[PDB]
Amino acid sequence: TSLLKQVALPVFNSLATTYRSVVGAKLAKYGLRFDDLQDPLKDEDVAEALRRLPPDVVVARNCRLRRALDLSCKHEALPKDLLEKQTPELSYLQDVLNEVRAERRERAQLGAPAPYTRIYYD
Amino acid sequence: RQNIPLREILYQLSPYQQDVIRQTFTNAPKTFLRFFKEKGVGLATFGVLFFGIKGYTEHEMHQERLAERY
Amino acid sequence: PIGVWSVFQGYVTPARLPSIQTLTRVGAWGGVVVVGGLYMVQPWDWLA
Amino acid sequence: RMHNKIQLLSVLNTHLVAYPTPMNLNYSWNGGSLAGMMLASQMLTGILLAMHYVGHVDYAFASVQHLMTDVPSGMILRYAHANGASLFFIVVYLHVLRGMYYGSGAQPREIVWISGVVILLVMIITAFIGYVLPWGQMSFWGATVITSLATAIPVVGKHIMYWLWGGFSVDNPTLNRFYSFHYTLPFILAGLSVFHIAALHQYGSTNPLGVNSQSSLISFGSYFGAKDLVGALFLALVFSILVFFYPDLLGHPDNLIPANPYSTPQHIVPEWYFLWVYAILRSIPNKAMGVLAIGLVFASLFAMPFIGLGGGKFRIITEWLYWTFLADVLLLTWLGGNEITPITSFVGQCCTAYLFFYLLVCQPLVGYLETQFAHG
Amino acid sequence: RMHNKIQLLSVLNTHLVAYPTPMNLNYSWNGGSLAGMMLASQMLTGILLAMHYVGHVDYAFASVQHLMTDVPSGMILRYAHANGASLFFIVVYLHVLRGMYYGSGAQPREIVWISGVVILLVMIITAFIGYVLPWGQMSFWGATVITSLATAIPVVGKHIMYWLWGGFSVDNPTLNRFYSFHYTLPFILAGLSVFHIAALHQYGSTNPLGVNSQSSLISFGSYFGAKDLVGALFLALVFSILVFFYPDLLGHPDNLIPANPYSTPQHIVPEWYFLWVYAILRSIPNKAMGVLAIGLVFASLFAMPFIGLGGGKFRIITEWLYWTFLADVLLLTWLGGNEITPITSFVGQCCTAYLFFYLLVCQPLVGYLETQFAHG
Amino acid sequence: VMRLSEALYQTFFKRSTVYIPMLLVGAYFSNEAIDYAVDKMWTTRNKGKLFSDIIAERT
Amino acid sequence: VEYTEDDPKPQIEEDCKPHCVKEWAAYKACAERIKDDTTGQAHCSGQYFDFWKCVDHCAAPKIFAHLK
Amino acid sequence: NEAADGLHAPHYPWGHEGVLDSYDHAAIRRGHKVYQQVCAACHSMQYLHWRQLVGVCYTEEEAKALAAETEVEDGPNDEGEMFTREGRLFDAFPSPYANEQAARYANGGAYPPDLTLISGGRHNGPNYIFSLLTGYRDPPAGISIREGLYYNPYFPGGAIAMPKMLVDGGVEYEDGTPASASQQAKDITTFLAWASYPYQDEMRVMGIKACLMISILIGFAAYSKRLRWAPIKSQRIVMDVVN
């Protein structure tokens, strides 16, 4: 497997860049980013990564989500001057989330759990 | 009830200070074309697969009926 | 997600899996179900 | 303030009037209210029909005819019940396909999906035993063919078959017990629906964008009552057309012949909403393997919130494979209504294999690749 | 906690395991769990019964006989379902008398009392129309006498009567609709029971001392599970005695005769739990006034949380008057099984007058005098 | 632009106890008009085929 | 149109028969090719059904034109 | 198999097929007369009563006179015996046989089925009935018919036990209509189509009213939906985020 898995990575990278191009074209009309597509209810690591963030980053993420949901209700897209400024691949969460997942993988090899649970309501 | 930190100004108009259904006639052809532009690929691949497999099956069934004749 | 995402994220390790003694004591409930079904149906010639 | 003084006002206000709901919900989020309305319609028209139906093999068909001709508004009630079953299955199938498209069963809504699969199984059993009540040719012979699948289980198959029949064949005790079970199971459906809805209100609905929506929530009662009324009126139009203009369109002509246990029809087929399961069963030339395949289909439906990755519009590979899955299930629906033939057997086998491939291979693996593409 | 992660386990834990209950409750607080057990038993036995019963004239009597002699365990099921109605009414009556003795409907438990009175009315209607179903002489003639009492409302009389009957006399349409209504009403009973229990849990139960018990509360699920099990075993002993040794003791022998619309029995009396209302109706020499008095009894029952002052012990005058009320009600129960005689008419009129006097004069005025004596 | 009259508002719209009987009489007349239009269209289209046409023909 | 006491349907069916000469030829070819059969299973019901389906589809609206 | 399926029937231009169209009630009357004189010797129609023909097919007095010409078994009397009487409006149509077994015995083992629901009880009902009645053709090559059976390619299997029963002039209509075999078949097919769906005209009138009312209510509900959602669909949100 190692003989063919040396060059199976550039094909993965090309497919990933094509995928991100198409989806980022879809995302930019709503003013969203790739990291806004991660739900703290859907993943407890994302919920952990989101409380490790400074408050202005969280305020900006909430503002972008509110704008996108308003656009989705109105069946609209962003205007051309806003749409040309959109940066769908500017990460704000991937470093913190990668650190959180690495910590959870480290605790699991020693039999320890994660020091957080799912978000439980009511 | 799930405090959300956010900074905005929101404006809203009374529903008796605007029209109700008059813009629905203007936007109707554009919305039709936008709907088919967005869902064109999925509806087409559904139609191609369903009608092609159904047509192939019905054709071969008719050939099977013809093969039983004397 | 919790089912296959946990296997793919590397969160399911041998140190986190249940022990072989735990699997022995949990799997002993299988004989209880067999004897409960035999008590309910009584489909035996076992009494002799 | 007034709803703060009585518990029943408070629960109703919280869960019906002031319940927060995402503002960007489209008309694909109306299937649940329509399914609840169709369940209420089925319960009302069935309760009204039960005052004139007699569950005996000498009077069942005759009482159906007497209700059709002599009872005032009896034809409207009977056609409304028989076609409301089909519209109930249409609305529920579209609801499930919405959930499959958006991946709505994912965390934290595993309980909602599991209670939904339970509801669908109870619905299938309810409709199947309700169809036997007119005691026509299809009503007799379909119950004979389907309850004879218990003999595929070795050793204790015929004993379970005779215990369910009450005798050596489908006869009067079968019809009487089917009538009691059929009257009973809709109330279990109402309880299951109440539990299913109260499970969703813990976290709320998902939105068409697939993102977190806690920043943009509006009251349910003021806004989504009218939006549900619009869809209810579109459903009432189709209901009126089916009841008054084409009442036997979705039926079978052989169910208007009285039941004869000594002469089977040439083409025993179920109602249309059981045809995909019937095609899955007929495609496999082994009764035990067919029953196992149906059970594995429903097990894969139960295991969707734990093996499924991949959701709505922004996850494009699974979004494209959804339409292939939809074409596959409609091909299974069409294949069930056709006779056994080598090409239909082959095509049914391939279609069942593709359904299993989509459920168990595409949803975990392709979902994981697109998560790695988008966020890796 | 495991129950803190699934919302079903949280509700079940909160309302059945860890629910704080006063520790000094005696064995007269086991009426409600016994009533729920009897409701569940009636539902189970009836759903089993409906698989062998045919709701048509000229088949109903024969289907009950085939159930009794040919269905395995069918005699046990029928006798259990017949005597379970009597035991259900015994338990619910003792529950109501407990609430009357202790003043259990007072503030803040008025909704509990009102939902109880609604449950009692639905129980009465359910038991009556279920008694019509075997289609004997008592069934037919009791259904005739009671439903032909709508000719007391002026003008709109026989119109309502003929719409109820589906004809001009009690016949096959009346039996056929009574089967559907009787099958359906116990699910409304179960839902009303769930609402009734949920209304009590807002404030918890009263105690035999009649004081605030917030300082001395213990868990329900450990301490009051075995205490309910003891009373359930006593009820099972009485139930088993009634089923196996005296199965026809509480009935009427005339209901074993097939119904004849042209020949009437000598004495037409209902089941024992309907006899006090029958005595109130039969004592007054006017049909409209009898129906008005029957309605006034239940109106005074609804008004009891808003007019009734006075509880158990430490309020001794109303405590003593409770025993006169109990004697009055038991006398009305005895009088309903007798014939119409001038002395029995006079005694029944006096008993009805004292029942209204206690419900509407003693409970407010004597209770106010007791409050002025104790805390004035 | 188009706007409901004030004097017509103060009479039939300000109180629900006046609005509801007006609603019921309007509902009655709307049902009568719909019945008339449907029956006239059906009888005009199917003229000569109904039973009443044969009975009036035999007079 | 004038309604006749005789049956117009056989005449109309005979009129549509030149419109389906190909199916008639196929049926007659089948009937000639199974002439020497001995097993008793050879039959020409399918080509017969083709011919009569063509004739029926021709003659169906012209039959009800002649009937009240 | 094609021979087991039988020949499909063509689609005839029936005048009641459209949702705006009523029955031809003169054809129902002529179809009942074919039923009394040809069909009813061996077919029962056990779910019809003379009361249901009133206002559709006959007046009250005509239906009473038709019912009074039939003999109906009634009883028991005061001596516990069975007697006969004149039929009335509430009586059902007479059955030619007392039971299924004598019906089979009179017809070579085949039971002629009930015709109350034979139109809705067959695929392509009226067209199949008309083509079966007018379709007793010559059998094709290699198809032999046993004695007591007759060829009909519209009957599934091709071998029916019902012989040719409609003949030219075999019914004398009272409205002057000439009675060929095709006219008789069309009229009895119309009567049987009425028998399967006796309330088709009333159902269609109610359906027209319901479709009109629901179509108006859809527009009114869309208006009230858009009025409530207007302050949300036109709201202005301004924030500091540019991205």
Ligand SMILES: CCCCCCCCCCCCCCCCCC(=O)OC[C@H](COP(=O)(O)O)OC(=O)CCCCCCCCCCCCCCCCC
């Ligand atoms: C022998 C028996 C004769 C029976 C004759 C009747 C058969 C059925 C009627 C004819 C059906 C054919 C045309 C159907 C058109 C439906 C509309 C449609 O497709 O649009 C959906 C769809 C619309 O897309 P949307 O508007 O984006 O939703 O159109 C397409 O995307 C095009 C679909 C083309 C694929 C199907 C082509 C036909 C398959 C035939 C395969 C034959 C295989 C032969 C192999 C053996 C050779 C020896």
Ligand code: HEC
């Ligand atoms: C699919 C869900 C479904 C539900 C829910 C349902 N039914 Fe039905 N019911 C059917 C079907 C299908 C039939 C068969 C109709 C037919 O083909 O005539 C039927 C027929 C009946 C019949 C026989 C009369 C007839 O027309 O054949 C009765 C009685 C009946 N149902 C009672 C009830 C009652 C009572 C309830 C609820 C309390 C109920 N049903 C709810 C599906 C349902």
Ligand code: HEC
């Ligand atoms: C197998 C799946 C399934 C079945 C069957 C099902 N549900 Fe749903 N339902 C769901 C899921 C998942 C959701 C949550 C979807 C969301 O909010 O995005 C949901 C949501 C709902 C909603 C809220 C709004 C909506 O329409 O999405 C209602 C109401 C509802 N269900 C009622 C019902 C009723 C009533 C029935 C049947 C009698 C039913 N459901 C059957 C899975 C199901």
Ligand code: HEC
């Ligand atoms: C007319 C009155 C009435 C009726 C009938 C009635 N309840 Fe009660 N019930 C009450 C009241 C009042 C209480 C509160 C007693 C207290 O806490 O002092 C109560 C309490 C209870 C309790 C708590 C335990 C107990 O017994 O105190 C249960 C359980 C209960 N009811 C169930 C039922 C069920 C089940 C039924 C009928 C099927 C029923 N009740 C009928 C009035 C009624």
Ligand code: HEC
């Ligand atoms: C409050 C009382 C009560 C409840 C609850 C009740 N029943 Fe019964 N039912 C009766 C009585 C009393 C009879 C008369 C029994 C007799 O005298 O034979 C009866 C008779 C019947 C019969 C006729 C057969 C027979 O032996 O009389 C059926 C069937 C039946 N019930 C079904 C049900 C079903 C089904 C339910 C619930 C889902 C139910 N019942 C609940 C009181 C009740």
Ligand code: HEC
């Ligand atoms: C000679 C006695 C007799 C007469 C008269 C008669 N039938 Fe038949 N009919 C039969 C028999 C026998 C069958 C069943 C044959 C079979 O199933 O093989 C039958 C079958 C039918 C069928 C059903 C065929 C099918 O595919 O199930 C219809 C419809 C029918 N008859 C209508 C009529 C009409 C219309 C008339 C009057 C023109 C009529 N019958 C007169 C003996 C008769």
Ligand SMILES: COC1=C(OC)C(=O)C(C/C=C(\C)CC/C=C(/C)CC/C=C(\C)CC/C=C(\C)CCC=C(C)C)=C(C)C1=O
């Ligand atoms: C945002 O999401 C949501 C929706 O989607 C847009 C909804 O639509 C609703 C509202 C839900 C509806 C209309 C579905 C109906 C609910 C249920 C549980 C269906 C089952 C209930 C039945 C059949 C009741 C009939 C039984 C009765 C009355 C008992 C018998 C008693 C008598 C006849 C007297 C809610 C709360 C919601 O949050």
Ligand SMILES: COC1=C(OC)C(=O)C(C/C=C(\C)CC/C=C(/C)CC/C=C(\C)CC/C=C(\C)CCC=C(C)C)=C(C)C1=O
């Ligand atoms: C015309 O006819 C026919 C039907 O009908 C309309 C059919 O559906 C089907 C085929 C349907 C399939 C394969 C899907 C539905 C399958 C099943 C097994 C339905 C479930 C019902 C069962 C097992 C009957 C037993 C009833 C019970 C256990 C009562 C429930 C009570 C309790 C669990 C306590 C066929 C062929 C049919 O030809």
Ligand SMILES: COC1=C(OC)C(=O)C(C/C=C(\C)CC/C=C(/C)CC/C=C(\C)CC/C=C(\C)CCC=C(C)C)=C(C)C1=O
């Ligand atoms: C010998 O004679 C007698 C009986 O006979 C055996 C009796 O029993 C009773 C006892 C009956 C009483 C006191 C009245 C019962 C109460 C009511 C309201 C009458 C029942 C009403 C009916 C049947 C109307 C139809 C309604 C039905 C079936 C259900 C309605 C549905 C819902 C509420 C959802 C008496 C007095 C009697 O002397």
Ligand SMILES: COC1=C(OC)C(=O)C(C/C=C(\C)CC/C=C(\C)CC/C=C(\C)CC/C=C(/C)CCC=C(C)C)=C(C)C1=O
């Ligand atoms: C003053 O203190 C209190 C008491 O006094 C000590 C009580 O007694 C109770 C209530 C007691 C309860 C709830 C237990 C009694 C049982 C009831 C009401 C129901 C009986 C049911 C039984 C035996 C089993 C039913 C089984 C099934 C399978 C039905 C369910 C159906 C499905 C799952 C489909 C309460 C709340 C209380 O506060």
